[PDB]
Design a protein around this nucleic acid. Structure first.
Ligand SMILES: [Mg+2]
Length: 1066
RNA sequence: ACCAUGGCCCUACUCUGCAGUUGUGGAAGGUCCAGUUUUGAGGGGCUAUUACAAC
């Protein structure tokens, strides 16, 4: 088999990027090893998989971690592993429905093996390669299988293009219509991934384009673009063509995600303002989903460093941004937000026998939660001596990741975590200090074991934060804070009175809290209607609901299995069915513990580590009908005391699953579990129907839920045990009184005006502003498709893009239009039971309608949230610098704005910490829209070693960007200098040429040695050549002193020049 | 081939994340209903999701 001509003609590019591909792979493998405490197919992580089904797995938690993370960092592995399952079923005449570690291992073994081969050929002037001999083992076992896998991978990757970029059949037909001939692979197609490569046996190998594709699976998008742009793989499509962009996008769509090295930026009032403006230029994710491909394309921007960026929000950061704004601004004197500052780890037992009978370290974690301004808390968290707060306890370095560490001397320690706000369950928790300028409230640690935490004063809905921000903007943060504190103190006075039994229908109004903001139980208690929930009703209902769900799951599973055995089940298309044992094992572990009876305050039920083991054990269980492996699996549940004689709290029905025979694998186990669950619940239903009393493990009659509430008992729980739950519409009356006094707001009906409405009226009427233009763009919703009722000739339902006015009117007419929809839709089901159809449609319309309504409500919240960020950011920056900005308006903000605030030029300075050092990058003048550049530079692996060479931690942004682009241009020229050096050595010393013919591997290190021994170079020169060459392969800079360098932005250029001169030879 | 019918809760803001139990709590949050809302406003039902304690 011959090396493809594309490879031979672009050898310096294939050489460079093959090395980058292999290094990136090793990086991921190394990361996974470290985090999990475990010839790339011999890596510890890959060995683990290889051995993972050699008998009953002793480290299921590790196996499952490796399988999950490999699919995160290598997204193409989901597609290829699915193809490898289907392949094996073929080969061994099996019907395995689920992907396992053998699939993952085999895909990656082959990918790595072929990558390594091409890396070696392209990085050597002359070597012998036995592996290219036609009909050899390498070709038959590894390379030829991989070419077919890659070709099948690309079928699915092109399907993914439709989802990810909105491409239509017409857009992709120049590839999809021409890949296969009539079905063969069309090796004559210009983007064919397979070719004969002059193989006399006439078997399909990877083509040059195919080799490029394999490499690009292991590159970052930036390098995919640099690499492919050098290659003549675009037939006659030109640089600006859509076809070129489609090709390149197809080669990056599922490529490697590299683990990020942690960065910590210094925040300020200015930085927060700029983080806010860069938030509002991006598309909210809920909106992005609804937009046409053209308008989605408008958020795909080219940066200053000529890199395409998706300007889309990955999460709603409104609330954290607002908290940073308040903290860095020092705007609240008394209120402090709930922060986490790491976790305490203490070793309970070094050798704990677990429910699978394997010994493991038992480490307990407690969060270090507290209250203060993020900067002040962070200054307290890490002392100079590297201890936490005033605790004495060591904070372990972030790079040290031995979580399995069994040495008692190493414990306790605190995990190093930058102070962040705790923002879970759409809440903000806060602590109210009596005095101003209080110090951060860090938790005390007792017995090196207990973290003594503090119940928050009170908790606010994140949906209340827009009105708080708006109130802050109109009145001032101090007035805002006084109002939160006053509301809090009213609830406290109420709950104190409850505890004295001094709250009546006659005096409830005196407490100053509206009925709609009192708990129903207080309202029940003063009305004389206090009652518990009816436990028997709840049991009867729960049993019925669960029986129904059990049957739903039985059916879905039988359906999916049949679907998975079908030819029509196509990955990347919409009705694609997959059975994940991970997903099965999640269901089973939750349910097994749900049905485990509690005793002794719940101290008998499965604990955290054993839970993780049980769940993982299930996920990977697959006896080969090996008797021991079956016994081992059953034994786990015996040791958890769920089945077995002499158990006192057994699971009610799990033991039936193991009666007669042990299930052979996770899939058998899930099926049998669900059948047994169905029989248990049917029995219960039948006993309920006879009027008998039944009990289920997870309903407990002694819980307060079921009893009548008392005033005094409930008073104490509300005062002492929980945070105060702050009401919605706290700030409304004050907001409305203010706005009523403004003459521009004169013609507003304030009796039908919520705060969402009034923010928008404020922007329009007081400020002559409006929301960003992309909130007027037409949107698509399935539900509105159904209501519009428009089909193509073939008879599919059309995807409309409507305006808000259109949808207003469809919604008014939804009853009629739903009637039409159902009539047509039912016919189309029948053409492909009356009750079953009506049910199928019922669910279709409900789900769709609910999706549409929620989406529209949330986008309307994003609008006014953006108004508030814009307003606050603009206020910060107005009062900074010699900056004038009364003219700027939210309506001008756009993802690549050429006007308004984002186009303004100001000096900037970005300070951050990475790997224990602290650096600053400055600009003398920079458009606000480019502030994101700094994170891109700080994130770059080279930033550290580069700044070691500059000899300054402070550097110009423009200089570093130029340096990084010049580095990127030098890297292939390094490859060429090596090539010409090797070539000289071969021409001068025929020893080397002979060593090729005698089938020995000649490498660079060897050639340096020959050059040294014949005094073509000396040790100094040898060492430099070696070190520079290594630095470029690492995609990094060499250590200081190796070579004399110039200043930025010519460091890489100067290193390239030195290499070139040290490679001349006598 | 085309066409048609994550275990979960990360393109700097911390995935080195989240994913055991028991208790407490539904004024909040989630979810469902509909002559409800393009004004996270209101109504009705259901529900421990944030937190803390103990293990
Ligand atoms: Mg309300």
């Amino acid at each position: 088999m011959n090396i493809p001509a594309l490879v031979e003609n672009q050898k310096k590019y294939f050489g460079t990027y093959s090395v980058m591909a292999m290094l990136n792979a090793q990086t991921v493998l190394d990361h996974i090893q470290k985090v999990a405490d475990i010839n790339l197919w011999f890596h510890p992580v890959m060995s683990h998989l290889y051995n993972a089904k050699n008998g009953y797995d002793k480290q299921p938690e590790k196996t499952m971690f490796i399988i999950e993370r490999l699919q995160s960092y290598f997204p193409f592995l989901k597609i290829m592993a699915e193809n490898q399952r289907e392949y094996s079923n073929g080969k061994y005449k099996q019907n395995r429905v689920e992907v396992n570690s053998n699939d993952i291992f085999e895909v990656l073994k082959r990918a790595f093996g072929v990558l390594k081969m091409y890396r070696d050929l392209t990085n050597a002037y002359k070597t012998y390669e036995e592996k290219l001999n036609d009909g050899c083992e390498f070709l038959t076992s590894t390379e030829q299988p991989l070419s077919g896998m890659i070709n099948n991978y690309y079928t699915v990757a092109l399907r993914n293009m439709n989802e990810r970029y909105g491409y239509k059949t017409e857009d992709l037909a120049f590839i999809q219509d021409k890949r296969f001939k009539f079905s063969q692979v069309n090796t004559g197609f210009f983007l064919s991934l397979q070719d004969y490569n002059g193989d006399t046996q006439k078997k399909l190998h990877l083509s040059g384009v195919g080799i490029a594709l394999l490499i690009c699976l292991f590159l970052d998008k930036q390098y995919i673009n640099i690499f492919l742009s050098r290659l003549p793989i675009f037939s006659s499509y030109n640089a600006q063509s859509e076809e070129r962009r489609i090709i390149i996008r197809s080669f990056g769509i599922n490529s490697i995600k590299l683990p990020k090295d942690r960065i910590h930026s210094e925040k300020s009032n200015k930085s927060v303002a700029m983080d806010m403006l860069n938030e509002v230029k991006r598309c909210p994710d809920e909106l992005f989903t609804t937009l046409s491909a053209e308008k989605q394309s408008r958020f795909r921007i080219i940066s200053d460093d000529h890199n395409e960026v998706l300007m889309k929000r990955s999460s709603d950061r409104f609330v954290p941004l607002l908290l940073q704004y308040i903290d860095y601004g020092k705007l609240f004197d008394h209120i402090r937000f709930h922060v986490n500052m790491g976790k305490l780890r203490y070793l309970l037992k070094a050798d704990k026998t677990c429910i699978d009978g394997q010994t493991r370290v038992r480490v307990i974690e407690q969060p270090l939660n507290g209250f203060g301004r993020l900067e002040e808390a962070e200054t307290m968290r890490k002392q100079e001596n590297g201890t936490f707060g005033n605790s004495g306890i060591r904070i372990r370095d972030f790079e040290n990741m031995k979580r399995d560490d069994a040495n008692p001397a190493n414990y306790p320690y605190i995990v190093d975590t930058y102070t962040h706000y705790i923002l879970e369950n759409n809440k903000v928790e806060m602590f109210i200090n009596d005095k101003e300028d209080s110090a951060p409230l860090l938790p005390v640690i007792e017995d090196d074991r207990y973290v003594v935490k503090t119940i928050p004063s009170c908790r606010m809905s994140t949906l209340e934060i827009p009105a708080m921000a708006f109130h802050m903007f109109l009145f001032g943060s101090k007035k805002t804070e006084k109002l939160i504190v006053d509301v809090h103190n009213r609830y406290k006075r109420l709950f104190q009175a409850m505890q004295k039994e001094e709250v009546t229908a006659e005096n409830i109004a005196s407490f100053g809290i509206a009925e709609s903001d009192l708990p129903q139980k207080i309202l029940d208690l003063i009305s004389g209607n206090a009652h518990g929930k009816d436990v028997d009703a709840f049991i009867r209902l729960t049993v019925d609901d669960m029986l129904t769900d059990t049957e739903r799951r039985i059916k879905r599973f039988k359906d999916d299995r049949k679907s998975i055995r079908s030819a029509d089940n196509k990955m990347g298309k919409r009705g694609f069915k997959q059975i994940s044992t991970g997903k099965l094992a999640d269901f089973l572990a939750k349910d097994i513990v749900l049905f485990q009876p509690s005793v002794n305050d719940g101290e008998n039920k499965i604990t955290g580590l054993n839970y993780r083991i049980m769940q993982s054990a299930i996920a990977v269980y697959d006896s080969g009908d090996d008797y021991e492996a079956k016994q081992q699996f059953k034994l786990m549940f015996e040791k958890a005391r769920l089945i077995g004689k002499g158990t006192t709290e057994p699971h009610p029905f799990l033991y039936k699953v193991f009666a007669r025979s042990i299930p052979a694998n996770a899939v058998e186990f899930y099926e049998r579990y669900l059948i047994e669950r169905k029989f248990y619940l049917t029995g219960l239903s039948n006993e309920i129907k006879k009027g008998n009393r039944v009990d289920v493990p997870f309903i407990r009659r002694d819980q307060n839920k079921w009893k009548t509430p008392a005033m005094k008992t409930l008073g104490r729980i509300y005062s002492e045990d929980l945070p105060v739950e702050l009401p919605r519409q706290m700030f409304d009356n004050e907001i409305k009184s203010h706005l009523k006094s403004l003459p521009q707001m004169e013609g507003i009906d304030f009796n039908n005006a919520n705060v969402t409405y009034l923010i928008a009226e404020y922007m329009k009427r007081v400020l002559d502003d409006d929301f960003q233009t992309f909130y007027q763009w037409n949107r698509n919703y399935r539900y509105m498709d159904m209501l519009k009722g428009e089909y193509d000739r073939k008879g599919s339902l059309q995807h409309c893009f409507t305006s808000v006015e259109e949808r207003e009117g469809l919604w008014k007419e939804r009853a009629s239009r739903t009637e039409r929809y159902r009539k047509q839709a039912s016919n189309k089901i029948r053409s492909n039971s009356s009750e079953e159809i009506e049910t199928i449609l019922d669910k279709r319309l409900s789900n769709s309608r609910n999706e549409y309504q929620k989406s529209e409500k949330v986008i309307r919240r994003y609008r006014v949230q953006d108004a508030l960020l814009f307003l606050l950011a603009k206020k910060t920056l107005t009062e900074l610098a010699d900056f004038d900005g009364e003219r700027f308006k939210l309506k001008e903000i756009m993802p690549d704005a050429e006007k308004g605030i984002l186009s303004e030029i100001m000096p900037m300075s970005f300070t951050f910490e990475k790997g224990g050092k602290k650096y600053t990058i400055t600009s003398e003048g920079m458009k606000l829209k480019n502030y994101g550049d700094f994170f891109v530079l700080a994130s770059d692996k080279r930033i550290g070693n580069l700044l070691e060479l500059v000899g300054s931690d402070i550097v110009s942004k423009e200089d570093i960007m130029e340096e990084f682009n010049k580095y990127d241009q030098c890297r292939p020229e390094i490859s060429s200098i090596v090539f010409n050096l090797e070539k000289w050595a071969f021409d001068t010393y025929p020893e080397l040429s002979a060593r090729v013919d005698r089938e020995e591997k000649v490498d660079f290190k060897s050639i340096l040695k020959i050059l040294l021994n014949n005094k073509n170079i000396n040790k100094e020169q040898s060492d430099i050549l070696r070190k520079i060459r290594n630095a470029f392969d690492a995609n990094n800079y060499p250590d200081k002193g190796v070579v004399e360098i110039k200043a930025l932005p010519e460091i890489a250029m100067s290193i390239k020049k030195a290499f070139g001169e040290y490679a001349i030879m006598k």
